[PDB]
């Protein structure tokens, strides 16, 4: 049975025999205790030339974790050269799906740092966790909306409201999927209609545009049109272009 002493895990076994060392399997989960200090290893730890990672509690975990040379792939026990659980392996020019997150590894078996072009497409891997970015991020005062590392196109909700992430060469040679300046004009995209104010944000709720009434979904900013709609207790009929009757 292990007990934490001054923020350091020591495995004392049972009989009050004071200490042990080496690899240990405590309830399915595998630890390594420093040979000289008998402390549960924590973080990036080198053992006999082979690399390992342990969380703050000394529990070995598999995944893509940051080492002194960059994020390495500590892998199952039979992936590359009879490796062992949680050992870093050689992983060259290949994608890695892990917990429904994407990673890509370069020539020297390290995960990507931020922007990286892979065979024609432009991926952005989160510099913090090395995984392909998901959601709304801002790089160099440029806004994007990522899905699995690739900037998407469309009207998506952002930190300062709904932004129109346009394709490349739509506004000041913008990058593909980068948010642009879209002021005081409607937008038809994938059958849904939008309208953007002076701040380039798709309006929501009830908005009167040009002597006509519109209602835009709070969640997607899409204009309500095509038939009947029950916007909270009352029935309304919107036209095809979003004009209520």
């Amino acid at each position, epitope marked *: 049975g292990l007990r934490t002493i001054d923020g350091k895990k020591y495995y004392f076994n049972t009989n009050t025999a004071v200490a042990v060392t080496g690899w240990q399997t405590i309830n399915g989960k595998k630890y390594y205790f420093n040979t000289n200090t008998s402390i549960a290893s924590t973080g990036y730890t080198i053992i006999s030339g082979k690399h390992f990672y342990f969380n703050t509690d000394g529990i070995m975990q598999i995944g893509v974790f940051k080492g002194p040379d960059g994020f390495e792939y500590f892998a199952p026990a039979n992936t590359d050269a009879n490796n062992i659980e949680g050992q870093a392996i050689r992983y060259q020019n290949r994608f890695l799906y892990l917990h429904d997150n994407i990673y890509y590894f370069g020539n020297n078996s390290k995960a990507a740092t931020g922007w990286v072009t892979i065979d024609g497409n432009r991926y952005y891997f989160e510099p913090n966790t090395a995984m392909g970015a998901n959601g709304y991020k801002t790089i160099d005062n440029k806004n994007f909306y990522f899905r699995n590392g690739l900037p998407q196109i469309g009207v998506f909700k952002g930190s300062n409201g709904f932004e129109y992430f346009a394709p490349a060469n*739509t506004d*000041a*040679n913008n990058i593909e999927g980068q948010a642009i300046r879209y*002021q*005081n*004009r409607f*937008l*038809h995209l994938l059958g849904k209609i939008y309208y953007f104010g002076n701040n380039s944000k798709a309006v929501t709720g009830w908005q009167t*545009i040009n002597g006509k009434v519109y209602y835009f979904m709070p969640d997607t900013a899409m204009a309500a049109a095509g038939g009947l709609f029950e916007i909270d207790g009352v029935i309304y009929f919107f036209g095809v272009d979003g*004009v209520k009757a």
Partner: antibody
Amino acid sequence: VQLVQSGAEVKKPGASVKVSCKASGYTFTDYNMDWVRQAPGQRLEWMGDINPKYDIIGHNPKFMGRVTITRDTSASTAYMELSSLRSEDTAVYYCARSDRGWYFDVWGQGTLVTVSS
Amino acid sequence: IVLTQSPATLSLSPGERATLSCRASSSVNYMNWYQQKPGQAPRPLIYATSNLASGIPARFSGSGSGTDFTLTISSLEPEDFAVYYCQQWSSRTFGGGTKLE
């Protein structure tokens, strides 16, 4: 490189006119279209621009219900329509390119569209 | 967002200086200019701001920052008499312009 439009059409109010713009000398899907109205002795006012991703975008709220723009890549042509036409929309409609999202490379000949009864 | 210009009509003679400006009522990053001779379609001159293409002489010097934007023509010519419109790219809004007599 040139953008050729359709001929001069003149009809009564409450009708519809479909103007076409035939692209020439370039790949029609690497740039976006555009439309602008210039009434006699009046400013330039923008209408809309189609994209190769079939998003018909940018309706001027003044024209949101009236206009309909479409694309035919197989013919390398563009189009623009205007419904519920009135005697106030008498003007000349131009096409235009978009160079990396800048300034309209080339313009069309400008189609004569006048409305009276 | 509306932008406005200093001279609407202007009568000058070939070989004189010409300066015309367009002021936006909001902070704006770039501005374009378009020339249009009577009867034929508009002609692009300036893009972004300090840029030009489509075969214009080097005397055209576009400048501007923030609200006020200005165009420069160091030397006028007889065949250059036409209307000059200014345009905002993002808001996709034009202006009244300026005529030459």
